[PDB]
Amino acid sequence: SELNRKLVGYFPEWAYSSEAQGYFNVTDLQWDSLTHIQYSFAMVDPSTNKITLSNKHAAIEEDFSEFDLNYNGKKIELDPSLPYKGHFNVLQTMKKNYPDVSLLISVGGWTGTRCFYTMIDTDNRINTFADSCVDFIRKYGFDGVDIDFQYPSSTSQSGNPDDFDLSEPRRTKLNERYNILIKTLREKIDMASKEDGKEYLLTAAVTASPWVLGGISDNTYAKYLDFLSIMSYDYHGGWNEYVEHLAGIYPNKEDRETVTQIMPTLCMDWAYRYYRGVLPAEKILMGIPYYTRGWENVQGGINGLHGSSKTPASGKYNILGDDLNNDGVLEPAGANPLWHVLNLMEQDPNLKVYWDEISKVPYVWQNDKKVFVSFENEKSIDARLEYIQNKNLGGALIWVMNGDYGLNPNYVEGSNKINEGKYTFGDTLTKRLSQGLKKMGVCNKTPDDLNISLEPINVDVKFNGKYDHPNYTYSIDITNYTDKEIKGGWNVSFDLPKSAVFKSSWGGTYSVTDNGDFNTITLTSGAWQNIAPNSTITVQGMIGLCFSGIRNVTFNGMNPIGN
Numbered sequence: 001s002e003l004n005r006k007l008v009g010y011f012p013e014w015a016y017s018s019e020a021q022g023y024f025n026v027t028d029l030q031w032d033s034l035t036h037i038q039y040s041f042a043m044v045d046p047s048t049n050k051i052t053l054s055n056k057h058a059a060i061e062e063d064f065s066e067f068d069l070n071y072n073g074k075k076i077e078l079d080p081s082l083p084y085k086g087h088f089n090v091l092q093t094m095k096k097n098y099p100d101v102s103l104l105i106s107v108g109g110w111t112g113t114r115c116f117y118t119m120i121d122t123d124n125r126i127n128t129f130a131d132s133c134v135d136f137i138r139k140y141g142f143d144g145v146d147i148d149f150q151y152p153s154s155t156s157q158s159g160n161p162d163d164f165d166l167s168e169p170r171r172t173k174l175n176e177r178y179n180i181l182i183k184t185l186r187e188k189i190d191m192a193s194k195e196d197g198k199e200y201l202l203t204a205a206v207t208a209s210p211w212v213l214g215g216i217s218d219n220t221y222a223k224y225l226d227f228l229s230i231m232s233y234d235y236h237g238g239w240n241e242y243v244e245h246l247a248g249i250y251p252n253k254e255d256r257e258t259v260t261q262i263m264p265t266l267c268m269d270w271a272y273r274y275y276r277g278v279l280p281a282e283k284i285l286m287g288i289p290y291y292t293r294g295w296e297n298v299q300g301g302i303n304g305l306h307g308s309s310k311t312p313a314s315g316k317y318n319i320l321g322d323d324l325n326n327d328g329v330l331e332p333a334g335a336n337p338l339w340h341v342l343n344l345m346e347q348d349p350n351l352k353v354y355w356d357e358i359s360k361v362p363y364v365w366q367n368d369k370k371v372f373v374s375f376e377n378e379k380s381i382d383a384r385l386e387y388i389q390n391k392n393l394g395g396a397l398i399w400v401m402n403g404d405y406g407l408n409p410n411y412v413e414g415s416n417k418i419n420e421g422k423y424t425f426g427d428t429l430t431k432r433l434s435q436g437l438k439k440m441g442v443c444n445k446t447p448d449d450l451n452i453s454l455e456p457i458n459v460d461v462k463f464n465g466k467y468d469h470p471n472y473t474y475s476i477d478i479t480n481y482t483d484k485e486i487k488g489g490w491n492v493s494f495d496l497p498k499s500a501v502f503k504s505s506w507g508g509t510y511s512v513t514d515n516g517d518f519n520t521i522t523l524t525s526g527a528w529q530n531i532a533p534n535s536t537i538t539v540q541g542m543i544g545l546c547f548s549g550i551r552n553v554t555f556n557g558m559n560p561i562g563n
């Protein structure tokens, strides 16, 4: 049911054959605790514009004869009656015992967004892609589609730099074309649901970055999603010098990267406020990382935090680093699954865990080597559960499921091998999240905007603007569709998400009233701003920082229903 809490986990297609990933396969998924599994990743084909597999062998061909498929201590065999093998066979086989766990195919990701740029160029290509998604979920027994386009933004040089040859020429239209993509997917998926007697889902994982969001002008697409997953992680990392939290929850005035900003933006709660402009809390999921980022040779800070470093952590502190040329030399990133950091702490008593009571996340600091790594533990899970309950969030998504921890069957005392430590992957944090989501009960239904309860007036209020970080210059066009002049002194109100701060109205007067996740802005015009019948007047002003949209628009205490 719609208001049930959700615990959504991303499954990595590439993990089962990789030492650093722990050889994690579908039978290692936390099936008793997740409500949804997002298979990562499918992509778009450059020549046909259809959904396509990345590692086809892993997805539908691997027989796992060289790997260990077992669950609850019982050997899992591939279902020999299915016309495919691979992860997809194991997913369908497990789902027979977990029929209420929804399976979605995630399309895109950091390295799989490239061909979205050309597929969105025309409506016929979007239609082909959307139809191919329907065919795919039917063929492979999926319950829905997750779109992970990184990113449909005009912000220059956002997304993967390998794709700038496609994204940079398209910046002005990306957001508009993405809105058409999501709407078309919803239309086709809903038709397939009716035809099949099944309730198929459409979701998206979306940016939490104020930098990316400055280039997003239309968040209407959110209304077409079953839920919207905020990527409230990768806030900080080895791409810059700011030794700060990967995935803080609450705004932290000591985050050195944002100390000059209007408010601290690199935390879940800022993105929550941003997206409340277009969605109720129960349709929003918090993103939770089961991986780390970090730095070495950290200068300054306190236990590293708020320090500086031009050298991301390497070596044993970076087992998930990329090998983008080859021969085992990994790009420094301080990137690890949580179980590996636990094992490092077993090995080194001076690698210690600390708690940030402002951001409500932990971190790990080696004071002799000056190594800082982000972390996630039972205390931060508990803080996240508290936030989910307090804010009425729909639940959480997790990147990525092989990073949770449990006891290692292959532990070897004294061994430094990646998969011979005390811990390997497991379900400790995921079970803790699941138990907490069960205990807090279903979400409340957020009430409709109050403007709908007001008496109607045939006035149209259109809110537009332009963003030049950190300044949003708004223009409101007010059209009088009644048969009488509206005298000057009229007022318009709107609810502005608390991701932004109203700064000034350029004409008339204004007031700001606290209203939950919003401030209600009331603009009162001057006596001279009469609105003749069938005419339009425009008023302007300035807002600091960005917001997904405005809500609850009123005019002279009535609901402006236009013409």
Ligand SMILES: CC(=O)N[C@@H]1[C@@H](O)[C@H](O[C@@H]2O[C@H](CO)[C@@H](O[C@@H]3O[C@H](CO)[C@@H](O)[C@H](O)[C@H]3NC(C)=O)[C@H](O)[C@H]2NC(C)=O)[C@@H](CO)O[C@H]1O
Pocket: 209, 210, 211, 234, 235, 236, 239, 240, 257, 258, 261, 265, 266, 469
């Ligand atoms: C035009 C201009 O100078 N704009 C400034 C912004 O760049 C800056 O925001 C920061 O932008 C960088 C990218 O240039 C962001 O880093 C990226 O972060 C993502 C994850 O969020 C990571 O995947 C990328 O690898 C990384 N790229 C690079 C090149 O480092 C950074 O997170 C942004 N920080 C914030 C707080 O938004 C803002 C800062 O306010 O200033 C603009 O003037």
